[PDB]
C-alpha cells in the first residue's frame, strides 16, 4: 500500500506529520526543489501537514479539510483503484491531403508455380481495397486479409 509524499519548494529542513504516524515529524529527503517520502498507508482517509523550515503548512495544490477548530490539514483518500496499474490508468483516462505512402503501391497478385499461392504482404497494405479496370461492364475487386497467422486475398467478380 505505498503512498508518495512530495514537497515542491525549497528548505533547509522539511517534515511530514500525519494521522498515519500519530503526527510525528518524519523527515523528507531533498533531491532538487522536491522533498519526498514514500510510505505504506491503509486504504482510507488520512490527514497530514508539513513542517517546512520552522513553519506548519499544507500543500495548497492538494485537497484540504478545515476543522471545527479552524485547523487546516491536507486530506488523502487512498482508493483501491490507486494500487493496480491498469485500474489506475483506466480511472486516469477520464489542412492539406497526406502524401500517398509508396507501400500501398506494392501488391502481391502481380509480382511454373502454384496460381493459388501468393507472397506474404506487408501488414500495412492489408484490409485495403484494390480494383481492376471495369472491362465488359463487370467490376473486379480485391483485398488481402489475415485470419490468425495466415493470409487470404479475396477476388470478387461483381457485375455493374
Amino acid at each position: 500500500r505505498p503512498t508518495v509524499f512530495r514537497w515542491t519548494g525549497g528548505g533547509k529542513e522539511v517534515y511530514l506529520s500525519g494521522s498515519f504516524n500519530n503526527w510525528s515529524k518524519l523527515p523528507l529527503t531533498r533531491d532538487q526543489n522536491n522533498f519526498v517520502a514514500i510510505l505504506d498507508l491503509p486504504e482510507g482517509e488520512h490527514q497530514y501537514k508539513f513542517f517546512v523550515d520552522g513553519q506548519w503548512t499544507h500543500d495548497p495544490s492538494e485537497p484540504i479539510v478545515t476543522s471545527q477548530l479552524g485547523t487546516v490539514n491536507n486530506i488523502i483518500q487512498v482508493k483501491k483503484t490507486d494500487f493496480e496499474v491498469f485500474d489506475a490508468l483506466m480511472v486516469d483516462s477520464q489542412k492539406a491531403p497526406p502524401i500517398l505512402p509508396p507501400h500501398l503501391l506494392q501488391v502481391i497478385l502481380n509480382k511454373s508455380c502454384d496460381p493459388a499461392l501468393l507472397p506474404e504482404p506487408n501488414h500495412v497494405m492489408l484490409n485495403h481495397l484494390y480494383a481492376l479496370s471495369i472491362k465488359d461492364g463487370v467490376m473486379v475487386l480485391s483485398a488481402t486479409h489475415r485470419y490468425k497467422k495466415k493470409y487470404v486475398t479475396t477476388l470478387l467478380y461483381k457485375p455493374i
Binding site: A116, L117, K148, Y151, V152, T153, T154, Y157
Partner: protein, 281 residues
C-alpha cells in the same frame, strides 16, 4: 492412422498466403468460366447478393454440364452459355432437385472434412470461419493426401486390400468426340475417362481438367472433335504393387487417379485419391 485426422484442425492445412476467387451469382456464366481460367483456379464460391450468403460453388462439372446439356452443333452458337447468368443456370440444373452449400470450419478436424467429402460426394470443400463468415480456402483431396504422405514416417497388394472401382469402368476411344465423352461424365458422375486404341490397350486419359482447355483456348464451340485431337495441346499401376508405393506414385506426380492395368497395358480397374482417403476413414 484415422486418429491423426480426428485430431488435426483444418486451419493447419491452409497455406501461409493464398488467393480466393468469388463470383456473384448475377455474373454472366461465360465470364465466370474464363475468370476460373485466368486466375488459374479449379473452383470458386458463389455469393448471392440478394440472400447475403454463399449459396454454392462453381466448378468444371458446371461447364461440362452446360456444354453437354446445351451443345447443338459446331455451326451454331451455344447461345445459353454465351448469354446466361450463373443464377439463371443454377435454377435450370437444380430445379426441384435442390442441393445446399457444404462447408467446413478451420477449427473443425481434418477427419470431419474427409468424411464430409465422401458424405456429399464432392472434390472441392470450402473452409469458412464462423464469426467472420469469410471463405478462407478450398480444401482438396490432393492437399489432404499431400499432408498425410509428408506425415507417414496396409503394406499389402492392391488386389488383396481391394480399394476402388474395378467393375464397369467408364471409357472412351481414340476417335470418340468430346461431346460424346462429356455425356459420359454427365450420366456416370466420374472425373476422368481412359482413352483406348484399336485394341483393349490404354493410350491416354481425358480428365475434367482437360475440359477447361476448351474454355482457355475458346474452342468449346466445336465438341465434334475426337478426344485425341482435343488432347493434342500436351501413368498406370499394377494389382501386385503395394498400397504404400501406390500412395507414393500418386503424390510423386500429384495426380487424382491411377489405372490398374494388365500385362499387355489393358485396363482392369481404377483407384482414385477419393477411395484411398476413404479406406483411411
Amino acid at each position: 492412422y484415422t486418429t491423426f485426422m480426428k485430431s488435426h484442425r483444418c486451419y493447419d492445412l491452409i497455406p501461409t498466403s493464398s488467393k480466393l476467387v468469388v463470383f456473384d451469382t448475377s455474373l454472366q456464366v461465360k465470364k465466370a468460366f474464363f475468370a476460373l481460367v485466368t486466375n488459374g483456379v479449379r473452383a470458386a464460391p458463389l455469393w448471392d447478393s440478394k440472400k447475403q450468403s454463399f449459396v454454392g460453388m462453381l466448378t468444371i462439372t458446371d461447364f461440362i454440364n452446360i456444354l453437354h446439356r446445351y451443345y447443338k452443333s459446331a455451326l451454331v452458337q451455344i447461345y445459353e452459355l454465351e448469354e446466361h447468368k450463373i443464377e439463371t443456370w443454377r435454377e435450370v440444373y437444380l430445379q426441384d432437385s435442390f442441393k445446399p452449400l457444404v462447408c467446413i470450419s478451420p477449427n473443425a478436424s481434418l477427419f470431419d472434412a474427409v468424411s464430409s467429402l465422401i458424405r456429399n460426394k464432392i472434390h472441392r470443400l470450402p473452409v469458412i470461419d464462423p464469426e467472420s463468415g469469410n471463405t478462407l480456402y478450398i480444401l482438396t483431396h490432393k492437399r489432404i493426401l499431400k499432408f498425410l504422405k509428408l506425415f507417414i514416417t496396409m503394406s499389402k497388394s492392391l488386389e488383396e486390400l481391394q480399394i476402388g472401382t474395378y467393375a464397369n469402368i467408364a471409357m472412351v476411344r481414340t476417335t470418340t468426340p468430346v461431346y460424346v465423352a462429356l455425356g459420359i461424365f454427365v450420366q456416370h458422375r466420374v472425373s476422368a475417362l481412359p482413352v483406348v486404341d484399336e485394341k483393349g490397350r490404354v493410350v491416354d486419359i481425358y480428365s475434367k481438367f482437360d475440359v477447361i482447355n476448351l474454355a482457355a483456348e475458346k474452342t468449346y464451340n466445336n465438341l465434334d472433335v475426337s478426344v485425341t485431337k482435343a488432347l493434342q495441346h500436351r501413368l498406370k499401376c499394377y494389382l501386385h504393387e503395394t498400397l504404400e508405393a501406390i500412395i507414393n506414385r500418386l503424390v510423386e506426380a500429384e495426380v487424382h487417379r491411377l489405372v490398374v492395368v494388365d500385362e499387355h497395358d489393358v485396363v482392369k480397374g481404377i483407384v482414385s485419391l477419393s477411395d484411398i482417403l476413404q479406406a483411411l476413414v
